[PDB]
Design a protein around this nucleic acid. Structure first.
Ligand code: CMP
Ligand code: CMP
Lengths: 200, 200
DNA sequence: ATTTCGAAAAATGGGAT
DNA sequence: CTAGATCCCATTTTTCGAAAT
DNA sequence: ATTTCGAAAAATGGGAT
DNA sequence: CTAGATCCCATTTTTCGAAAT
């Protein structure tokens, strides 16, 4: 598109191999990122390193924007690269400037923020209102909306593990597995290895 | 500041008695809200009516932002007044106009959103990583610092129901009651009716 | 404002499963 | 195996309109 | 360089507490 | 109660880098 392009013009594009961490919770935040290509996972952990996945971000989403509005802010979570990433990088100081010349770019960001607030709130509702089976069903549909989810004549297909799912819904891999098996006995999904087919 | 008194001059002011509903989850979002005076509670309901408090918002806070960035959005949650409120209202349309003649007002909107994402993500963590006692201790500490908390010779005093505390942490009122009694057993808090004294 | 008084409505628990 | 969700009115507690200060 | 292939690694299946 | 958390291990998928084309 028009605007958003000009933005990348001041960002210092970089490359991050899969598994590499782009952001570390607790660091001083001074840089705003923009995933040009690839996808990352935003996650948090407890006092024992046990991790929960807050969200997946893909090509086109901004990253590390939370420290931009208040000074002296630290990174709110860890951002790990699920795949290989081509990430633009501009400093808050410079970004605040690009806003002046063209505020439409702040609007783009704010829209994405709004969306994350909606999703995160729904994630809170889920954690407080649904049992694991519910959270898992909802996450299966959600994963089916990701851009790296393939198509299937019976619906949609995703490639993910019972381990991962557990970190998204907040349960054990053992639990996920049992429920994944059950949902099969109801022909709601198709399970075999990292490959799961969600019937539409 | 100017920008505010200017913003408010284009807004339609409304008053709501405490406990009244300001926003209905589910309806079409076409209006922006700004709390001039008073405080509200943002909350979502389950299929059976069970309530989950997502946040308390006060003076200076914007409400109903989440619709602004995209067409056909519905209110993401219910907003009920805690105290009587004086709220400034403005359509999205009219608001998109004001942003263009001073996007600084959008900067402040975005600033609040970022904060909310931080707080809501941290809530996800708490629900995921902390047990009820942990969550309840956590909430009493935060409530103990809010604007409406009263000073007490032995610390800080708050008024709230076990029921409302459960709607904040995500557990039954019964559980709150038992945990509340155990916290007193450990001289951490004094509780008489809705009056809870958090020892400093 | 808010202190008082009598409902009327809300909020609590207790411990068994 | 085990934090807790549930069950449930008889009993508190608190809220509120009306009147008084 | 890119594809093939055969161990290591990582991810599971369920019953039991 | 009663969903889930945890244990335990021997088995299935997956992952990946040395080899081969
Ligand atoms: N709940 C969430 N949903 C989506 N993205 C998030 C969430 N929490 C944090 N992030 C992202 O993770 C980043 C961590 O560092 P920042 O706080 O700078 O900015 C944060 C956001 O980009
Ligand atoms: N997690 C949250 N934290 C704070 N405020 C919220 C949260 N979720 C929703 N809201 C507010 O409640 C509003 C409900 O309607 P909107 O979706 O228009 O906009 C929402 C925000 O104003």
């Amino acid at each position: 598109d028009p605007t958003l392009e000009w933005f990348l013009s001041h960002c210092h594009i970089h490359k991050y191999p899969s598994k590499s961490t782009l952001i570390h919770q607790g660091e001083k935040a001074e840089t705003l990122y923009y995933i040009v290509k690839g996808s990352v996972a935003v996650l948090i952990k407890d006092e024992e390193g046990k991790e929960m996945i807050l969200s997946y971000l893909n090509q086109g989403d901004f990253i590390g924007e939370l420290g931009l509005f208040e000074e002296g802010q630290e990174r709110s979570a860890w951002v790990r690269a699920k795949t290989a990433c081509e990430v633009a990088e501009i400093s808050y100081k410079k970004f605040r400037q690009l806003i002046q010349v063209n505020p439409d770019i702040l609007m783009r960001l704010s829209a994405q923020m709004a969306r994350r607030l909606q999703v995160t709130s729904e994630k809170v509702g889920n954690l407080a209102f649904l049992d694991v089976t519910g959270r898992i069903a909802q996450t299966l549909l959600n994963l089916a909306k990701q851009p790296d989810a393939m198509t299937h004549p019976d619906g949609m297909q995703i490639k993910i593990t019972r381990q991962e799912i557990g970190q998204i819904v907040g349960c054990s891999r053992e639990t996920v597995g049992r429920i994944l098996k059950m949902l099969e006995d109801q022909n709601l999904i198709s399970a075999h290895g990292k490959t799961i087919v969600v019937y539409g």
